Amino acid sequence: SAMGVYAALLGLTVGISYIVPGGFVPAQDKQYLISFAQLPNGASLDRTEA
Amino acid sequence: NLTATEIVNAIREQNIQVAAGTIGAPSNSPLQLSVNAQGRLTTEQEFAD
To answer: How many Cβ pairs closer than 8 A exist between chain A and B?
Structure first.
């Protein structure tokens, strides 16, 4: 029964090794963020400045 | 009544690219439009013309 339980646990490990999503590096906070503004094409620098 | 050096100068003069610039680039105009013209020749007919 111990051997059977061991085989069942090995199968459970193999099954559960496929449900976790993958990744490389988690996204953390570096005390700053960026913001982009885009004007309609052909706009002068004064409008973007304002 | 022609010479080869004049021919070389003529062909070199008429086969140069031109950098025009921009209209509306210190100005208060709300538009900034680049300007382009015709520069280098490509086909044999243009060279022969």
So the answer is: 16
| Reported resolution, Å | 3.1
| Contact assignment for A44 to B33 by CB distance below 8 Å | no
Closest CA to B32 of A47, A1, A43: A43
The method recorded for this entry reads: cryo-EM
Flag if A47 and B24 touch (Cβ within 8 Å).
no
Contact B32 A47 (CB under 8 A): no
Q: Which residues of A6-33 are buried (b: 16+ CB within 10 A; e: fewer)?
A: eeeeeeeeeeeeeeeeeeeeeeeeeeee
